[PDB]
Specification:
CATH topology of chain A: Beta-lactamase
Largest interface: A-B, 19 and 20 residues
Radius of gyration of chain A: 17 Å
CATH class of chain A: Alpha Beta
CATH superfamily of chain A: DD-peptidase/beta-lactamase superfamily
Number of strands of chain A: 9
Protein name (chains A, B, C, D): Beta-lactamase
Family (chains A, B, C, D): Belongs to the class-A beta-lactamase family.
Strand order of the largest sheet of chain A: 2-1-9-8-7
Order of helices and strands of chain A: HEEEHEEHHHEHHHEEEH
Catalytic activity (chains A, B, C, D): a beta-lactam + H2O = a substituted beta-amino acid
Oligomer: homotetramer
Subunit structure (chains A, B, C, D): Monomer.
Structural class of chain A: alpha+beta
Pfam family, one (chains A, B, C, D): Beta-lactamase2
Chain lengths: 265, 265, 265, 265
Amino acid sequence: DLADRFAELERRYDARLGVYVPATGTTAAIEYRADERFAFCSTFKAPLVAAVLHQNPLTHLDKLITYTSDDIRSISPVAQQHVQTGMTIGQLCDAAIRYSDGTAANLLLADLGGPGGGTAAFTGYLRSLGDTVSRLDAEEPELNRDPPGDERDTTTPHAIALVLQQLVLGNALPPDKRALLTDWMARNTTGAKRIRAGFPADWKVIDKTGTGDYGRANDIAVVWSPTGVPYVVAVMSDRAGGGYDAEPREALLAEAATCVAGVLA
Amino acid sequence: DLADRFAELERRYDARLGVYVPATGTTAAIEYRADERFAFCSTFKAPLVAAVLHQNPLTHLDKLITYTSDDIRSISPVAQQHVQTGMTIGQLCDAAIRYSDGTAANLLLADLGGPGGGTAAFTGYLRSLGDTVSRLDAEEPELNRDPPGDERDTTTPHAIALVLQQLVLGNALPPDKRALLTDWMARNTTGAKRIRAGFPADWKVIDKTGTGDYGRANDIAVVWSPTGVPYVVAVMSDRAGGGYDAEPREALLAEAATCVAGVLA
Amino acid sequence: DLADRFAELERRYDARLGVYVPATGTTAAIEYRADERFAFCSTFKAPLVAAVLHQNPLTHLDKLITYTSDDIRSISPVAQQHVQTGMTIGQLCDAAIRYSDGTAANLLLADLGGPGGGTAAFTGYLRSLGDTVSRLDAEEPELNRDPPGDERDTTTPHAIALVLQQLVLGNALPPDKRALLTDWMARNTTGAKRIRAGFPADWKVIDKTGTGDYGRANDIAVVWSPTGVPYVVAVMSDRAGGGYDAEPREALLAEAATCVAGVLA
Amino acid sequence: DLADRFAELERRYDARLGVYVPATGTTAAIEYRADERFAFCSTFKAPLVAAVLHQNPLTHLDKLITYTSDDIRSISPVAQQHVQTGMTIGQLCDAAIRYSDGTAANLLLADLGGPGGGTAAFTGYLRSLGDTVSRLDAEEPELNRDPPGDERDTTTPHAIALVLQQLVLGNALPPDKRALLTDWMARNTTGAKRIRAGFPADWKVIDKTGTGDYGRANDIAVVWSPTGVPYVVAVMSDRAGGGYDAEPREALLAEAATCVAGVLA
């Protein structure tokens, strides 16, 4: 049916594809490799910001954080410019969502505290939303390069989608903090050629991307139909076997997102 | 199986929907009420320009055509402003396609000459392209308001798609004239809410719309995937049971375009 | 000096130019040939609708009017399509504003009643707004063809701008009927190459055009700056030297509007 | 007299405005703070692409360039997505112009080679085009945040306009390379709210923006009137007194551009 096409896309792009769209009152749940583990990559930065939002008051966003050149370890377009100034938690939230800033992610993890620099605290926060599957075990950038089959730093489309649904559409955050998360995801700058490129333009798309080694490309998104009905779309992919250096295939995520749009129309 | 969703859309918009997409080297043809007659409405203006282009050398586009206020019998956004100046044949071609100018269509028909002010010449031109089904019997605006069931001024999605395929993708025109038709269709200003609105923005869409009474709304198009594969999409609809005054539902054609887009991806 | 450029534009297009923009709380009044008479042409159809609106309850808009083929005298893109069914007064209002339908204008004049088919009733209505200068003496299409120098069927930019100002921005109509006037002008289809083409796209433009012999091209408009400040812009022009058959020059009005936009910015 | 409005805009936006429009055969040169220094910001990325095109044959564009995560030290919407793949010289030129990619600019500077990572080679190239004032001293992102008064990384409206005039309209590049620069600037995606917003839509606008700290917002452009005459428009601004964190005001540049268009009309 529809699962036969995702296979075609798996063959045509030489990737393992995972897609999950939660069921609504009007549509059935789309599942393809939904409960298989894919690496989080940078998509955890969306549940990372809401966690800082969850246990901290709004004033905590004005707290300034100072850091050194040694702390810059992953792709960090914003953090590199403020080593002299330092950045506040709210600025780190912006940078981690809207630019996938690796260093802001590592700093926000440290703000959650705990063992492993915040990995235990973050995974613990996922648990509070019913997610018993995903886990975060490393920081940036090691969390992008775990070998295929390794369960560390992984989620599944099924799990990441239900988490994202409670954060954007559900009640996991009060509306005060919820509009900050959504607005950062809405003005994302890293995801133009993924889920957003597969949906018609009169559909509104907020997303958080993830990219890593072994051809890992992810995109988690909330979409709104032109009449205003919201859907959650989890799209993950890798190309293990093509090797650690496999090039990620963004076109696969865009093609699969047009596939989803055909079902929801 | 795509027919299950189209019929659901017929029920939701209170309309009869017709869709045909020709088969390509790799994908099968999409059909839904493909061989049922729908009223041409303004979609005939696309093969009409091709007919004028076919019968005349390119310098014929400079011939100046004058008309009077009595010639303005229908919505004519460009022809209404040049009654003192007149318009050249190429200017009538521009207006008949990019603004669906009614008077420009009537003049171009008269340029084909023959019985019925050019309707016979235009219908014959369809015959020369293998179209054994379509027929144009009146001019603007009478062709938009034939009662439901009347075969006059009707085509079928199957027939209009094959005609459009030879004009844009085939060789029914030489390359110089073919690029003129394509560019006029590419810069159409009337189809933003139909097939163009159902396809992702990285798909190129050239189209010609048609609208008339009894809630008649059509859109014929050639689309190009982001990888450059061309497909022809003929979408037609009326709501004849709703009466002469029934409103066309443009969103029906955009949604049908999104269902088709999911299959072609 | 803005008066030097208008004179420049006069030589470059071989035309007489008239511009009036009422003074606001923040800007000075723009004047160029403001108190010289130009032919109404179709610009009277905007205050004509307000006259029908003023004397009649909203239910008067539902009155059906029947007419014959002898009643169609001028460019009438809409009236030609409803000779069998007829059009309601409200449809004649829509048709007169958005398509400059000459025949609908003649019927709306007859709706105002009085001697000369409503011309006496119509100028009388202008007088009720302080306009002691303008006058309408004929119906369509003769009102377009008066010799240069004749005072019949003439207004001035100063007079038509202040009238239009009371109708769109002032209190000449109650808000309910006033929103009907403003909406019809806002979706006008005949003015894309006049004032609308000379203002940036983030400026909102509602207008009513006029065209006639002796190269007569007009546009009266209300514009809104990107911050929401409204201005009234009256632009009229003819080329009485080029003769009766002189071609109207729309680019002159578009260029003249860019000079105005430069001063209001 | 155009200097009075430019003044009122400086006061209205708490900003210093710089405007230069080179003189053509019929119109005089518009100057406002024409010879004062404003920070380049990203506007130098347009002559930088022209420098790379000038010193290399067209095949040099296919050379693949690799970079590390440590090379991303500024907003790089395209370079961030190809750290594993690498990018060709032509892809960096595309990214440096159409998305203002900071990393693509730094690599393109490195392609120019020489002392200072190419900054001295870039300044030397401007010198060869007659530019006696401009200077580029740092790369991204330090060049955006020089303190007010520091002459480093500055040009002038007068100087940047004449450089741009030679690159697009003059003969500094052969037609094959010149059409490459022109097409990149024509499809820029960062300048919709600056010079492009102040000009009517029937004016063709190609531009390259620049933004930085101290409220620095620039836009350099070539515009084409509807009849096809080209003008070069240099608009630069900062708000240095408001501090390092001062917000740039894009509307100042659109408003200044509408004043310029009123004069060029």
